[PDB]
Amino acid sequence: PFFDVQKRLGLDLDRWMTIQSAEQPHKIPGRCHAFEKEWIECAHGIGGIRAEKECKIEFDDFVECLLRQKTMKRLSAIKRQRDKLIKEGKYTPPPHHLGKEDPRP
Amino acid sequence: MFMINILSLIIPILLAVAFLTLVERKVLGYMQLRKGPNVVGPYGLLQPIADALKLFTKEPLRPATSSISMFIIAPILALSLALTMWVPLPMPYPLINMNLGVLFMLAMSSLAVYSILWSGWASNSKYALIGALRAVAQTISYEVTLAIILLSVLLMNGSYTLSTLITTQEHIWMIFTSWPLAMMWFISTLAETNRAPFDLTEGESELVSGFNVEYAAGPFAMFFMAEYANIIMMNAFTAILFLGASHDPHTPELYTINFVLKTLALTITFLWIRASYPRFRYDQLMHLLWKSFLPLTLALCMWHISLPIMTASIPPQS
Amino acid sequence: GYSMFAVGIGTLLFGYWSMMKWNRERRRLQIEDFEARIALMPLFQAEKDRRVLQMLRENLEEEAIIMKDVPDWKVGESVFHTTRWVTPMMGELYGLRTNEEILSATYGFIWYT
Amino acid sequence: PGIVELPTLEDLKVQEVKVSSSVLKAAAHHYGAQCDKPNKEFMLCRWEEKDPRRCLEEGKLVNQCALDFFRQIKRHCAEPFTEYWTCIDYSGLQLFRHCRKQQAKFDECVLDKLGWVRPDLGELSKVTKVKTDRPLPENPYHSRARPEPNPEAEGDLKPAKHGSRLFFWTM
Amino acid sequence: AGRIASFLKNAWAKEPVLVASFAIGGLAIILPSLSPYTNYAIRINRATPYNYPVPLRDDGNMPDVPSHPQDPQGPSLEWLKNL
Amino acid sequence: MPLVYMNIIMAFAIALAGLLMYRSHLMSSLLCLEGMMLSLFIMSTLIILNTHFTLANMMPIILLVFAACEAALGLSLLVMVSNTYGTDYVQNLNLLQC
Amino acid sequence: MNPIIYTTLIMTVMSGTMLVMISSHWLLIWIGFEMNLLAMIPVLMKNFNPRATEAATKYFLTQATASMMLMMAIIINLLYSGQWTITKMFNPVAMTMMTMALAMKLGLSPFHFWVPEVTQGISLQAGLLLLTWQKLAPLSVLCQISQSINPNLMLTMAMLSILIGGWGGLNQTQLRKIMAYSSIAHMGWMTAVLPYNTTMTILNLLIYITMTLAMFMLLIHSSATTTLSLSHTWNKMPVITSLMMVTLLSMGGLPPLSGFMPKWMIIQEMTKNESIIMPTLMAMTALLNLYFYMRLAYSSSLTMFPSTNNMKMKWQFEHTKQMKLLPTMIVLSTLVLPMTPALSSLN
Amino acid sequence: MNIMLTLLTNVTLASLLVLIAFWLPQLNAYSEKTSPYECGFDPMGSARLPFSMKFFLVAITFLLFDLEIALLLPLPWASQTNNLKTMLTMALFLLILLAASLAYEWTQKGLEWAE
Ligand SMILES: CCCCCCCCCCCCCCCCC[C@@H](O)O[C@H](CO[C@H](O)CCCCCCCCCCCCCCC)COP(=O)(O)OCC[N+](C)(C)C
C-alpha cells in the first residue's frame, strides 16, 4: 500500500515539496513558516492519534495564519461598530485615517 | 496624459498602415516594370485616403446564412488585437513596461488567429470555411517552432523583458550570434502573418478571397488594417530582437530613428519577397516547419542552453 | 559551399566571443548594484519596523475609542494562542483607512506599468 | 488570547533620513563602509529576536549613524556629491554605470577629505561577525513544552505464548 | 570505418538538415563536460548576493569571519574582475 | 473565505455538472473536462500564491501537462468513434449493456 | 501493435501503479493515476473493433471524471492545511470527495455501471488486467487514508456493491460480465473491512487476485466467452472443466476451500468492533454469487451438454501456447486454508 | 490599470469603426444580394456539413508539443541556479525526449496526411 522506498534508500523523490517550511529557493519563507514549524515540532514522533489532541493549539494557530478567519471577523466587528457610531455622529474618524497624515519614511 | 499617449501610439500606426498599402503597390509596381499609383495626389500620396473613404461609404452586407454575432465580432477582435500588440514595444521606452513582454506578445498573437477562424465560420460559405481550416493548419505548422526559437534567442538576454534587449545588444547585434535562428524566425514570421509565400488563408488564386470573401466595405477594411498593422508590428519586433540599436538615455530620438529605419527595411523585405516567389501548398508548409525547422530548432535550443554555461557567459537578472 | 559555411561559422565565433565578454561585465555590474541594495537594507528595515508599529498603534487607539460601548470586548486582544510577534495582515494595517491607500497598498505594484 | 503590547507613538519617534533613493544609492557604498557596525548590530538583533518591538534602540542608532555620515558628506563636499546623485537620478533604472566621471570625482573628494576608500567588488556582501552585549534570546519562538514521547521498545524477544492462537491452530 | 563513411556521405547528400541537427545536438551534449569554464559559471552564480547576508554573533572563536567588510577574511571576487 | 475562492469552486461544480449531464455531442463533454482542469489550475494557483509556497509554483504547470495528455487522449477516442459512426453522438455507443 | 510497444505500455501501466504506491506527495499520486490511465487506454483497444472502441471510451470518461474529482479533493485539503503529504485528510468535504473519486476508480456501487460493459467489450487478456492489476492503486490510497474516512459512506457503498454484484450476476450468460459482477461484489467485501483492519483488505485482495487470475487463465486456455461455448470444453479438455469447477466453488466461499478464508477473516474482525448486523447481511447476500457460480458449474462440468461434429478435428491438436503460472494459481486458489495464520506476515 | 484602459480604448475604437461602417452608408439589401457566394451558382450542399481533416494526427501531436513549451519557458531563470550540472542535465533530457517523440511519429508515418 505504501512501500517507503524513499526512506529505505534515502532518496528524497518528493519529500522536498511536501511542506512549506522545507528549504525554498533563495531562502524565501512561507507566509506561515513559523506556525508550521511549531506545529510540526510539537507533533513529531508522537503518532497521529496523540498529535490531534495534544497539538491542537499549534494547529489552530497554523490554520488561523493560513485562512485568517478570526482576524477578518474581528476587523468586521470593528468596522461595523465604526459605521454605526459614525452614522449617528457619535464618533469622528482621526485625520490620519482620512488621508491627511504626516507620512514617514 | 496617458490617454494622450495611447492616442499618440494608435493614430500614427493607422496612418503608417494606410501608407504601407501605397508603398507596397508602388514597390510591386516598380519590380514589375510599371509604376503603381501616381495619379491620386502627387506620387499617389492621396490614394490611401481615397481607398479608406471609398470603403467606409460602401454598403456592408450581412450574409443570410451567416451567424451575425460572430460575423461582426471577428473584425473587431482582429483590429483591436493588432492595435494592442504595440503597447509593450520599447521605442526605446514602452507605453506599458512588462516583465514578460515577449510572452504577452506570444499570447496575444495566439489569440489573433481566432478572428480568422471565427470570421470564416460565421460566414457559412464554402470558401470561407476552406480558408478557416487553412488557418488552423497554419497555426499548427508554425506555432511550436516559433516559441522555441524565441526561447533560444532570449537565453542570452536573461529575461522576457523587451527593454532588456537594448542592453543585451549594446555592442553587437544579436544576429551575429544566432543568424540560423534569425533565418528560421524570419520565415516563421512570414508564415505567422499569412504573407506570401505562406499566405494560404487568403488563397486568392485558389479560394478567391478565403476567409474574408463574404466581407464587404468597412468590415473588410478592418481585416486589411489589422493584417498590415501585424506586418509592421512583427518586423519592429524582429528589429528589436536581432538588430538592437544603440540607445542614448539623454537623446532617445536617435534610437527611435534607427529603430524605425530598421523596421522599414524589414517591411520592404516582406514586399520584395512577395514580389519574388510562388505560393507554398498548405500541406508543404507543415512539412517544411515540422521536418526541417523543428529538428534544427531543437538542436539549436540545446546548443543555446549549453553555450552560456560552457563559456561562463550567462546573463543577469534571474 | 565551403566558403559560405566558413563565413557563417566565423561570424558565429566572433559573436560568441563578444557576447561572452559583455555578459561577464553585466554580471559584475549586477553584483555591484545588489551590494548597494545590501548596504541600504538596514535603514529600510528600521523605518519599515517603525512605520508598521505606528500604524498598529494608531489602529489600537482608534479601536479603543470605537469599541468602548460593546460590553465584553478586550481592546487589542490577539486571535492567536502564541505570544510571539505575528506579521500584520494587510487588512489590519489599512483596515480603517481610505480606499485610495488600500488600493495603492494592494494593487499599486502589480498595476504599475 | 492575550493583549498585544505595542510601543507608544512617543517611543517610535526619531530624526528621519529624508533624502531620496537616488541620494541613498549614490552614497550606498561608502555608507556601508562607514556605518557597518550599528547596521550589523541592528540586523543581528532583528534576525535573532524575530520581533520588531525588541530592536527599536538599535534602529535609532542606525538612523543617527546615517545622519552623521550624511552630515560629514554635506560638510566636506556637497557639490561633487550633488553632481553624482543628479546623474544617478536621471536614469529610470538608476544605473551606476552611466555616471563614472561624477562618481570618480565624488570618490576622490571623500578619499582626500575624509580618507574614505570605496569597497571593492564582493565585499559588502560578506557574512561578518558582530560582538554584542545583548543576551542570546532563549525562546524566540515562544514555544510551548513539547509533549512527551511514547516510552520505547525494550527487552528480549520471546516467542509468542501458544503461537498465533488463531481459532484452532496450535502453532 | 568505410560503412559509416558512405553512410554519412549519403546522409549529407540526402538530408543535410538532419545531419546538421544531430551534429549540433551532439556538440551541445558533450562539450559542456570538457570545458574549464563551467565551474566559472557555477561560481559566478554563487557570487550573486540576492538576499541580505545575515551577520554572525561573535563568540571569540571565529578566526576566519570578517568583522568589517573591508577586512581581509571572507571570500574574494578578485578572480571575477580579471575574468 | 474570500469571494474569489467561492467563484472558482462554483466554476468547478458547474463544469462537473456539465460533464455529468450529456447531450448529443461527445466534444461538448470533452470541453467540460477541460473546463474542470482550468478551474483546478486557477484554484491551486490562487492558493499557492496566497500562502507563498514557493516550490509549489511548479505544480500547476504539471497539472497543465497532464491535462493536455488527457485532452489528446479524448480526441483520439473521438476520432475512432466518428470513423465508426460518422458522428460523435453518445447514443451510438450502446452496444455493451450491464 | 508492435510487441515492443505492447511491452512498453504494460510497463508504463505498472510503473504508474508503483508511483501511486511509493509516493508521499498527493501530486505524485495523481500523476501515477494519470500515467496508468494514459498507458491503459491503448491496451483495451489492442484488438480493434467497435466494441473495444466503445469500452475504451466509457473507461476513459469514467476514469477522467474520477481524476478531476480526486484533484479537487487534494486542492481543498491543501486549502484547509498547507499539506501535500498523504496521511489523514484535514477537511471532511475533501474526504467525501476523495472517497467518491476512489470508489469511482474501483467501480463500487453506485458507480459500478462501467465495469460489466468495459469488461464485456475487451478481450480476455485485457479483462484479466482490468480486473486484477487496476485495483491495486486506489486500494493502496484508501488504505493510507483509512483513519480519516467516514464509516457510514464507505459501508453503504460496500453493502451496495455486494448486493448489486449478486443481483447483476444472476442475469448473465456472457462470462466476462459474470466475472465483472463477481469483481464488484468482491470489491464490496474488501472495502467493508477497510475502516477496521487494512490487513484484512490486503488479504482479501490477494486471494481475490489469485482466484481471478486462475479463472481468466482457464477461460483463455479453453477459448470461451459464453456459457454455451464453455459447455463444449468437456468434450475436448475435461481436466480443465474439473479444475474450473473446483475454482468456482472456492470463489463461492465454501469451506474447506481458500475462497472461504477472506470471508471468514472479515466477519470475525467486524464482530470484534461490535458489528454483528452488517456481516450477517454480507454473507447471506454472497449466497447469490454462489448461486450463479453453481449454475456455471452445472452447465460446464457437472453435466455434459451436447457437442458438434467438428470437435473431432480439434481432438487431434495440442494447445500451441501454455501458461506457466496456471498450475500454481489453481493450487493457491483452492488449497490454502490450512495456512491462514500466515496473514500476520501481511501487517 | 493602464493595460485595462488600453484594451478598452482599442476595443472601443474598433467597435466605433464597425458602427460607422454600418450606419453611414445607404443600405439596399435583398435576398439575391445576401445569398451565399459560390462563384456564380447556388451551392449544392450546406457549408455546415462535416469537412474532413487529413492532418488530424498532427493536430493531436501539436497539443502535446505545445505543452513542451510550457516546461521550457522557465529556462532563462533556471540558468541562474547554483547546481548547473543538474539543471543542464534535466534541460537536455527534456529536449532529447521531445526529439525522440518527433522521430517516432516521423518514422511511423505519422506526419503524412491521410489520403
Ligand atoms: C473613429 C471612431 C469614432 C469617430 C467619431 C464619430 C462617432 C460616430 C458614431 C457612429 C454614428 C454615425 C453614423 C452616421 C449616420 C447616422 C446614422 C443614424 O444614427 O441616423 C439615423 C437615426 O435616426 C433614427 O432613424 C430616428 C431619428 C430620431 C430617433 C429618436 C431618438 C431620440 C432623439 C429625440 C429627438 C430630439 C432631439 C435630440 C437631440 C438632443 C438612422 O436613420 P437610417 O435611415 O435608418 O440609417 C441610414 C442613415 N443614412 C440615411 C445616412 C444612410
Ligand SMILES: CCCCCCCC/C=C\CCCCCCCC(=O)O[C@H](COC(=O)CCCCCCC/C=C/CCCCCCCC)COP(=O)(O)OCCN
Ligand atoms: C545525440 C544528438 C541528439 C540531439 C540532437 C537532435 C535534436 C533534434 C534532431 C532530431 C529530430 C528527429 C529526427 C527524426 C529522424 C527521421 C528519419 C527519417 O525517417 O527521415 C528520412 C530522412 O532521413 C534519413 O535518411 C533517415 C536517417 C538517415 C541519417 C539521418 C541523420 C543521422 C545522423 C547523421 C549525422 C551523425 C552525427 C553528426 C556527425 C557530423 C559529421 C562530423 C526519410 O525522409 P522523408 O521525410 O520520409 O522523405 C519523404 C520523401 N521521400
